[model samples]
Target: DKVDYEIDYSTAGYSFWNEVNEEVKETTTIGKNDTEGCLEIKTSVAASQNHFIQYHTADNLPIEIGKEYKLKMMVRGSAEGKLNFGVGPWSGRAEGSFSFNTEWKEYEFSFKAVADGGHVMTQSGLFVGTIQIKYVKITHS
Candidate 1:
């Protein structure tokens, strides 16, 4: 139907974003690029099991149990790579690894919410290249 929850990096800024793994704070840089209308994440460290870093909104996505929701977003990377995109918490989250190229492309997936409070997350531990996200939107039908 219509968009329920949304965030545009162009205007949302860094105030509402967070990095889950504090250890990556020294190797990764995250910031909003107003001119490009996107969020940019650059990590000097290569992909590894140690990089359990997650980037998500400071606030959780409000969800109603059993309702089917669709997540859509624009993403790109400096080089071809894969990243995990997920919604909800660890107990009952829908997630998958998706591939992205250097050009902006829209990726989408659908899942039913099993919990009420969930976070929209992007797991970035697949590559060392820069990743950019323009916006994120969630809609329920």
Candidate 2:
């Protein structure tokens, strides 16, 4: 079986993504702000804050062992900051990081899940976990 998944922001909600701290707004859409249709995650000032969004896997997602998966997202910074995205009970440890750009930019990351552990992780479904974001996607392996 082949595995594949995708996210269509057109169906996203206003607060689908939540902030780490209660002080800041959870998720904000970059619709008009970002003509390219991206979402933005704002972090707290504590410097210890990590924020992310949880995206449920689409039914019949095509994930498999020994295969490479590419996760792509668009991001931009309202202010100077750094953010990372990862899959978990990989515990947010395995991640890809990029500097925040003022203009919307597309970011892509590729990872090959260890064969022994890949099935367990995919069976648990995939997550869109982001420390910050402009928008995101999980694609072809």
Candidate 3:
């Protein structure tokens, strides 16, 4: 038998948004609904890497070694662009590329944690050019 463990921003919310490129310029705000928080990243002429952000895995997240987890989010772009989404420490992280059009859709990525390498200080890394991200949630069992 398996116990069903879950976590969500569909209700509870993105607890701590640990950011990337802490300085240049970006904005995040809460919207009307519980899951409608918004985030924007503008390209920096000074550099390319500045257009990125991350939400560190929340404390309430019940991370289980070797148990699979599904990460979910709803997103749409201002225009269109390629973005990278992954769990990092990038050296041995899970990474994926997403091509966006001007539409809102939910995206899902799955990764299972290892005892040491995969579970160490993980973060939900979001990178690349301009984007509008609405909400994110993660769950495991």
Q: lDDT per model, in order?
A: 0.75, 0.40, 0.48
Tens digits of lDDT, candidate 2, 69-97? 77665656655455554533332223565
RMSD of 3: 5.4
Question: Which sections of candidate 2 miss by over 4 Å?
Answer: 1-3, 14-38, 49-62, 88-93, 114-134
Per residue, candidate 1 scores C-alpha lDDT tens digits across 37-141 of 788888888645523666773247877878898888889999998878667875667776668899899887788876876777777765786889888888887
Q: Which stretches of candidate 3 lie over 4 Å from their true place?
A: 1-36, 44-46, 50-60, 88-92, 115-130
Worst 10 residues of 1 by lDDT: 50-59
TM-score of 2: 0.54
| Candidate 2: worst-modelled 10 consecutive residues by lDDT | 118-127
lDDT ranking of the models:
1, 3, 2
Question: TM-score of each candidate?
Answer: 0.85, 0.54, 0.55
Clashing pairs in 2: 3-62, 3-63, 4-62, 39-134
